[PDB]
Amino acid sequence: VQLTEKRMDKVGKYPKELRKCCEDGMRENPMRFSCQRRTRFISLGEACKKVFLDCCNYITELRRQHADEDIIAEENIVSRSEFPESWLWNVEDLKEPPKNGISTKLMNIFLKDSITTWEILAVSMSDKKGICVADPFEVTVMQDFFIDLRLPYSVVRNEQVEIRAVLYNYRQNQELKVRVELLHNPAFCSLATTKRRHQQTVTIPPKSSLSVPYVIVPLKTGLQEVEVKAAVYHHFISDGVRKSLKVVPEGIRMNKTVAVRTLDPERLGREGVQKEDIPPADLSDQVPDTESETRILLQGTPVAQMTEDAVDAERLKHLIVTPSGCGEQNMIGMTPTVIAVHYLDETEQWEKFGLEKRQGALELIKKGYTQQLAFRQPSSAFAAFVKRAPSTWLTAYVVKVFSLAVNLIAIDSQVLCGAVKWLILEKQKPDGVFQEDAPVIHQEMIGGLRNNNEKDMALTAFVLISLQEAKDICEEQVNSLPGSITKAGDFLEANYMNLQRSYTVAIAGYALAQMGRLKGPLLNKFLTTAKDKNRWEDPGKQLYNVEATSYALLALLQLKDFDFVPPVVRWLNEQRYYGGGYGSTQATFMVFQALAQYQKDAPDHQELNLDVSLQLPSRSSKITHRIHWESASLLRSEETKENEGFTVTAEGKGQGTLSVVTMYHAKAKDQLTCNKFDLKVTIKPAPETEKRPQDAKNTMILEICTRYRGDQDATMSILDISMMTGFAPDTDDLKQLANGVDRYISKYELDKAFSDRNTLIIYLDKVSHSEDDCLAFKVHQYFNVELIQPGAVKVYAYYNLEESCTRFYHPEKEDGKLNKLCRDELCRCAEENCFIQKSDDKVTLEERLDKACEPGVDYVYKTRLVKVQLSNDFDEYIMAIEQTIKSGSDEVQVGQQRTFISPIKCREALKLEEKKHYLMWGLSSDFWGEKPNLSYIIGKDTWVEHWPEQKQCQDLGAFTESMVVFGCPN
Amino acid sequence: TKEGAAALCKMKHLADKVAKERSQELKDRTQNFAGYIEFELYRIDYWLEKLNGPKGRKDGYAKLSDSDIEKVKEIFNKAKDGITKQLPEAKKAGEEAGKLHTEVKKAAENATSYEENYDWSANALQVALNSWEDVEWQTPYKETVEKLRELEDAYQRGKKAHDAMLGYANTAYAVNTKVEQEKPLTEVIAAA
Amino acid sequence: SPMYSIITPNILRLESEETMVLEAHDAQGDVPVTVTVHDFPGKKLVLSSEKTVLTPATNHMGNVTFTIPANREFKSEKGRNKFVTVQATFGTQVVEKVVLVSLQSGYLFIQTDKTIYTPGSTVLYRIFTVNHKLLPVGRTVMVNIENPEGIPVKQDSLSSQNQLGVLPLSWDIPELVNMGQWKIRAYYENSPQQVFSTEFEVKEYVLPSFEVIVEPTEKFYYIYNEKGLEVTITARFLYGKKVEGTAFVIFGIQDGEQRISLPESLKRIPIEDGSGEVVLSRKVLLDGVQNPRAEDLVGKSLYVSATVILHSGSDMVQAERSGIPIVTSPYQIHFTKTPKYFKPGMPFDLMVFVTNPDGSPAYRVPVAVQGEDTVQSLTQGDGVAKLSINTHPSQKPLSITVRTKKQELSEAEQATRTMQALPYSTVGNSNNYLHLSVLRTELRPGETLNVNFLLRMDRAHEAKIRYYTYLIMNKGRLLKAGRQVREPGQDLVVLPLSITTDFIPSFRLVAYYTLIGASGQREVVADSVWVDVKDSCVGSLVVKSGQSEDRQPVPGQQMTLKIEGDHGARVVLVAVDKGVFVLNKKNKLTQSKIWDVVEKADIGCTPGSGKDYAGVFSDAGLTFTSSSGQQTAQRAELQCPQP
């Protein structure tokens, strides 16, 4: 009783310092973790934990003894911030014949479609008189009748959604009679029919809202329009609503890379000709009735696509396939564009590409700097997240980027020089090794006691590389930079020999070459360690090997050794796996910079004179492309809508790239085996006593735990949860988790729409390997939907996308109630497309014979059901063929089993039972692919009849007798 | 015999390497101690000044307990006093090394084997190589080894001074980033 | 015994029109005069010699107008502020005076769309450039937008040439950007030492479901009110329906910047039909704070925080009311516009500005002088009331006390105020005094004003004085000057002055005279008075609705608006939401704010008369100098003396 009063009284004690801990302890943890368990997550000192434990124990005991609304009054009050956007922003001059100084002018404004009181402010600026201000003018606009149709974000194909419309009346002491109707649309099955229109009368009482529900069954994919009309009696009102909804296929959209090849007819090719074969993609899990698309891209130069994408703001974010919300990823705006600009400034390509885009690129860089300023701390240090401990690595990276960008844009000298001073004086140790006092991000962690020095060497090399750039910018401000540089270089040179990891060797060698100390035996270490004179690779790492190779390439370019460089360029080019490029930001930036540096510092100019011939197997005419240096655009594209392998011929001169990428829809299935993760997702009901919001209809609890499968993870793992149709997450729980003292998560975005379905991305600082890191939260369902399909959850690391896994979760049900929104007609609208509708339960022999023999009919099989497999999206029937009446294009022997795929909604339509004879016949479109034992998809044109092994028996036997009398002569 | 010619070529190559590589490098590594000791003394003085200075808000030092401030100031003053005495030893050593390097360079200017480049050692091998070789240009070679050993001793003096300075240099930097976090008097004084 | 005198403003501004007054006494025939300006250390002849004839037909009065061109400073690093010598040769003798000079001339007004913004929204702002006379001027300006931490984010340089001052500007807020009170600075290239700045706040995205309003029944809480503070709370939706549920209310005391929450002021109230009442008793308020004295807590404010929870839904909304100043007297008496110096024997007038605790002027509140019980001067609409008293002949400091006597209020609740003043010393000890009296009315442009001149001195020599010289100061410049003739035997004189638009927003009249003097040294006696005029636009600007009054406009329908303004005027329009405008109270760009800014920069800083003959001129912003020893002290400070 009076739990809030007790909580307030207990919080009254303790000073203003140790009161946040107690207040957080008062809050109920979303998960079922004990107070002792929760105290482990406290990052404050040893005094906050004691108060937190005391308050947790006290409140737990008090509530247990007690076992009204128990909510603590907020101390930091918040007010409404979102307001209607201002308009009428224009300037006009009064030019009319004055009358004793008065000059009238008539305006023509258009009031916005909203119900609010607007205020118009007028300020005049005369010459003889001066500035003056008039009083505001109030304009009030309101309506008596309002309609609002509520629809979900997206609906899966072949679903049962119950859309609704809300009617609002703003009259007092007067009810409103209205008639509401929904217009028929052939795309989806509705209550209204073509012959009969659905209309209904409703009375809205004064000062109240009324709900009108509706049910629609979507059939066709794409974008559909739903329009509702309302007519008011006794008053001339003809208002209505029209809203667009999205219907998506039943599956997950996945775009996959097919091939990535390097074109160089002279060197790589033989006799000045190169022939390359691109095999067909492996679309073995394509969802039925879905279209795939293949794209072929020819790049004249290895750095054309990135250079063109960086300048454009629209395509800037497409260079990566990962979210960018934190500190380092926010640099995506600055690092690429700058490089591109530089690559265009030194080389004579601006004229061809276009000079006018340079100003836009500078504006993008300015906006990137403005966004980056958000992460600055008062100590001139940048942290991974807002209000967190500063990190040396991020600070050094930001310093380097700002030093590079100072020439192009106006970078404040104060911030850069202060960051340099903080890096030098504070973090650097007397010995000359930079220390880190923040969680590791880029796998710089120590690998052990023997590998402890490796972390120090790597961090020192990176910080030295960053600092060397910021040498001539402000050297008078910081007079201790040369000494720190010399000490770091001496330390790096001292222990360069005792290096095992390829990345550390490469970075140290690059730093020493930049200083100019990589001579003698040290150099022998850098060149010899390379494998096949081509790459710097280590087992188990994919996206870090490319970065190490880029560092080695930069070191080689610095050393002025162009004999060993060309081989590495080919390997670097053929490292595009994710989509059509590199996923990780760091790897992409390093590859871009290395390739740009190689192109800029070229002893000879390799003019582009590429001639490419493509001869698709389906297409008859051949396609020819001619890529030349004078061409304004060095990028060619081709699109096809068929899975096939094709040959390409390249002749001429120059080094180019050819990328073939396929896009298709994949089926929903749990990953066979995770790489280095173990994900588990569970969605369960919730107690009915929970106070759901006004609009929500149901509530559930979703848990999503995981554990690393290695020595340790660190890094920054990101979880992605694909929400469902209608279901939405609870922001209160996420806010409590993120802003609470026991911080379970780093940050949640919940503000992206990259995928068709709603998504929630959670950023995690680390994943425990010894134990299992877990988190649960509540979700609410607003709309009433049936036959809902499962969602998905993906767990992956950022810098290494290969280590990832996926899981699927479905709302718990398991009930043969086959709940369906239909009452009497709507399912009859649904089963029409399922399969050919027989004219009668048992049609006559003549009709059956006439319908059996048609030009489109190719196969007629009499079979016996073997097994039926339950599922969620598509039902499967393992069937064995007993007798053959008419063989189709494919040849099948007697006794060979061919599986059958049917839609879920047809489960109660076909009415197929195991171990029963049946007859059927369909069209050639039922064949799916060409895999051995091809599956038969039951389409609309697929006749099926029961075959008995007693009037019905006599009639069916008489019908059977006439089926094999003739082999369908006509 | 060709062995004598090979030995002569090896000795010439070693002498050239010492004259052009070791001599120049050695001098540049002797004048850096003075520039580092003074820099670290200045940084320590700046850190002390920032502590309880004309203003506050110096990260965690602002809320630091009154008792801990006295100990921090005492240890900073002790380190500053200890580190000062090392300056003259490096200052004199720098000029001595410079003069000796100039003399050695002047002396050097006054005055088969390729497969042996794996040796990569030119520290004190000149006198010994001449020793095996024996078993107008010969006279200057006698004092080169003595001058090189004297330079090595002079550099060793500065190296020892710098290494000794580290003992007092490291303690101040430790307590700095120790108190810089949320570390209370306990651990601090315990380690001090 | 001819005399020649010259009067100039204390501070002369560069690139501005300045005027100097020349007068001669006891002169026969034409009196040519040549005025020149030179640099303080050296001679540069910054201005050509200006010659004017003080013919007897003009009663030996004239003026010279000039503007000092902007030239390279002679002593900028060698001195703090530059001085300029101005000399005048009337006849055989010459006069000279040193004057301080400044370059700052002009103002920049920044108008913003809203005060609260969210990430992704666009900020639209304008800048208006005006000159000393509040007229458009073409000059280069530089504008910077800076984040709260002090790191500029945007910089631009614009020019108002070929435009009527308006400089439209827009900016885009990044999605992920610093949150705080961002600043926008703007200043001229010529004078970077003066900067005009505005501020705007950016907040997170928030949208409440239902509106809750909590307000007290009284604007202020009286100390001895045993009833306590009563607060009413209402909660309603945006579509009309009320809110029913339960609310938690907590009171607290805010002082300076800190706030203390009373632990025994938490109450739970059931809100039915969107209404609820709470009461904070005197006993709880007194016992909450250790301070036992009830008079000591005067000054602190009271705030209330309320939270509302519905019955069916789980939606919550929080509301707070901050303010409610604690005052022991509703009305307050202030001594601001009244002179602080009294002339012995002469009647003394005082001005009292009765104001409400919030700050608004009072209306219908009687006030009187304690001890004398004089006529209760009812407060006017502007809030200023004038009270007259008779001074004593003794040469002692004067003390006055004033109190309000509003009806149906207790004696204790009545406010009180005290004031002290020092006597005005006479140079010759002749008890010569001049009094300028103005009938205080609601004067506005287009209304004559009568000024009464009174003279007090011995009867031995009264025929010598036959005229008075008066000058008017408005916005620093000498707006007008003239003479008033007095016939022998008439002690009191009347001067009708026409009030025009130039006198806005106020003016100061300084009137003086001179006489031969029995001792032998010419004596000068001066007096000053200040008058305020209603603040209003020079022209007019009206925004009416041209559409006929048929029915309230519906959304999406086209309508018409009638804009009436001065001929050839550039009109700027903007449509802002009512809620945002009402929520904003400090950055409103009103005519009153502009006039306050204009009046703030005034060379003269004094309510009324000074202490000596030179004191009056110095306080009024004039410098009186002549050939004889009579001279005023120089000014070596641009700003007025600090309190």
Kindly list the structural domains of chain B, giving each domain's residue range(s) and its CATH number in brackets, ordered by start: 2-191 (1.20.1260)
In b/e form, how buried is each residue of A749-761, taking b as 16+ CB within 10 angstroms? eeeeeeebbbbbb
Residues within 8 A of A (CB atoms), C 181-210 only: 203-209
Which of C546, C556, C580 has the CB atom closest to A106's CB atom? C546
- Cβ-based burial of C48 (10 A; exposed 0-12, middle 13-18, buried ≥19): exposed
CA separation for the pair A717, A739 (Å, rounded): 19
Placement of tokens 């922001």 in the chain: A731
Residues within 8 A of C (CB atoms), A 363-382 only: 367, 370-371, 373-374, 376, 378
CA separation for the pair A792, A668 (Å, rounded): 9
In b/e form, how buried is each residue of C68-98, taking b as 16+ CB within 10 angstroms? beeeeeeeeeeeeebbbbbebbbeeeebebe
Which of A81, A128, A374 has the CB atom closest to C116's CB atom? A81
The pairing of beta strand C622-626 with beta strand A117-125: unpaired
Both tokens of C416, joined, read 């009180």
CA separation for the pair C54, C63 (Å, rounded): 9
Verify whether the Cβ–Cβ distance A86 to C133 is below 8 Å: no
CA separation for the pair B157, B93 (Å, rounded): 8
CA separation for the pair C6, C25 (Å, rounded): 12
CA separation for the pair A419, A441 (Å, rounded): 19
- The one-character DSSP state at C317 is E
Element (DSSP H or E) covering residue A318: none
Which of C246, C561, C577 has the CB atom closest to A107's CB atom? C561
- Residue A436 near residue A392 (C-beta atoms within 8 A): yes
- The one-character DSSP state at C520 is S
CA separation for the pair B63, B77 (Å, rounded): 21
Verify whether the Cβ–Cβ distance A430 to B170 is below 8 Å: yes
- Residue A872 near residue A918 (C-beta atoms within 8 A): no
Question: A179 pairs with which residues across the strands?
Answer: A201, A231
CATH of the domain spanning A145-248: 2.60.40.10
- Residue C352 near residue C388 (C-beta atoms within 8 A): no
The correct answer on CATH 1.20.91.20 for the domain covering A3-67 is: yes
In A652-708 the beta strands, taken as DSSP E runs, fall at 656-666, 680-685, 698-705
**Nearest CA to CA, how far is A45 from chain B (Å)?**
7
CA separation for the pair A278, A160 (Å, rounded): 43
- The one-character DSSP state at A237 is B
Task: With an 8 Å CB cutoff and a minimum of 3 pairs, decide whether chains B and C touch.
Answer: no
- Which residues have CB under 8 Å from C243's CB, separation 6+? C210, C212, C235, C236, C237, C271, C274, C308, C310
The resolution in angstroms reads 3.6
| Closest to C576 (Cα-Cα) out of A88, A80, A82, A110 | A88
Rg of the Cα trace of chain B?
A: 25
CA separation for the pair A576, A588 (Å, rounded): 10
CA C575 to chain centre: 30
Both tokens of A303, joined, read 């750095």
Q: Is C147 on the interface with A (CB under 8 A)?
A: yes
**Residue B100 phi/psi, 5° resolution?**
-65, -40
Which of A45, A429, A520 has the CB atom closest to B173's CB atom? A429
In C107-227 the beta strands, taken as DSSP E runs, fall at 107-112, 116-117, 122-130, 140-146, 152-159, 169-172, 181-188, 196-202, 211-216
Both tokens of C305, joined, read 């925080």
- Chain A residue with Cα closest to B170: A430
The 3-class secondary structure across A365-414, one letter per residue, is HHHHHHHHHHHECCCCCEECCCCCCECHHHHHHHHHHHHHHHCCCCCCHH
For chain B, the residue count is 192
CA separation for the pair A144, A206 (Å, rounded): 11
- Number of Cα atoms under 13 Å in the Cβ half of residue A361: 26
Q: Is A631 on the interface with B (CB under 8 A)?
A: no
Q: Is B35 on the interface with A (CB under 8 A)?
A: yes
| Closest to C126 (Cα-Cα) out of C140, C113, C111 | C111
CA separation for the pair C616, A219 (Å, rounded): 93
Placement of tokens 């607060």 in the chain: C231
Element (DSSP H or E) covering residue A908: helix A907-910
CA separation for the pair A153, A373 (Å, rounded): 35
Both tokens of C261, joined, read 């929450």
Query: What letter represents residue B28's amino acid?
Result: D
Q: How many of the other CB atoms lie within 10 Å of CB of C27?
A: 16
The pairing of beta strand C196-202 with beta strand C211-216: unpaired
Query: What letter represents residue A164's amino acid?
Result: R
CA C526 to chain centre: 25
**Nearest CA to CA, how far is A430 from chain B (Å)?**
7
CA separation for the pair C490, A721 (Å, rounded): 98
CA separation for the pair C205, A716 (Å, rounded): 27
- The one-character DSSP state at C557 is -
Measure the CA angle with vertex A716, ends A711 and A722; round to 5°: 115
Query: What letter represents residue A181's amino acid?
Result: E
CA A661 to chain centre: 19
- Cβ-based burial of C483 (10 A; exposed 0-12, middle 13-18, buried ≥19): middle
Q: Is A330 on the interface with C (CB under 8 A)?
A: yes
In C488-642 the beta strands, taken as DSSP E runs, fall at 492-499, 506-515, 523-532, 542-544, 558-559, 562-565, 570-577, 622-626
What one-character-per-residue DSSP string does A177-196 give?
EEEEEE---TTEEESS-SSS
Q: Is A379 on the interface with B (CB under 8 A)?
A: yes
**Nearest CA to CA, how far is C281 from chain A (Å)?**
19
| Closest to A435 (Cα-Cα) out of B33, B32, B174 | B174
Rg of the Cα trace of chain A?
A: 35
Both tokens of C42, joined, read 């050296």
Q: Is B169 on the interface with A (CB under 8 A)?
A: yes
Verify whether the Cβ–Cβ distance A487 to B36 is below 8 Å: yes
CA separation for the pair A176, A145 (Å, rounded): 9
Measure the CA angle with vertex A915, ends A914 and A919; round to 5°: 95
- Residue A652 near residue A609 (C-beta atoms within 8 A): yes
Placement of tokens 């059956």 in the chain: A848
| Closest to A392 (Cα-Cα) out of B177, B99, C352 | B177
Verify whether the Cβ–Cβ distance C572 to A123 is below 8 Å: yes
Which positions in chain A touch C545 (Cβ < 8 Å)?
Answer: 137, 139
Both tokens of B30, joined, read 């002797």
- Residue A603 near residue A597 (C-beta atoms within 8 A): no
Distances (CA, A) of A456 to A492, A503, A711: 9, 13, 20
Rg of the Cα trace of chain C?
A: 31
Question: A104 pairs with which residues across the strands?
Answer: C564
Q: How many of the other CB atoms lie within 10 Å of CB of C237?
A: 14
Distances (CA, A) of A9 to A59, C193, C507: 12, 54, 61
SS3 category, C213:
strand
Element (DSSP H or E) covering residue A610: strand A609-615
Cis amide leading into C505 (omega within 30): yes
In b/e form, how buried is each residue of B125-157, taking b as 16+ CB within 10 angstroms? ebeeebeeeeeeeeeebeebeebbebbeebbeb
- Residue A779 near residue A699 (C-beta atoms within 8 A): yes
- The one-character DSSP state at A823 is S
Distances (CA, A) of B177 to A43, A425, B74, B181: 18, 11, 17, 7
Which positions in chain A touch B40 (Cβ < 8 Å)?
Answer: 430
Residues within 8 A of A (CB atoms), B 135-164 only: none
The correct answer on CATH 2.102.10.10 for the domain covering A827-962 is: no
What one-character-per-residue DSSP string does C371-440 give?
TT--------TTSEEEEEEPPPSS-S-EEEEEEE--TTS-TTT--EEEEEEEE---SSSS--EEEEEE--
- Residue A210 near residue A167 (C-beta atoms within 8 A): yes
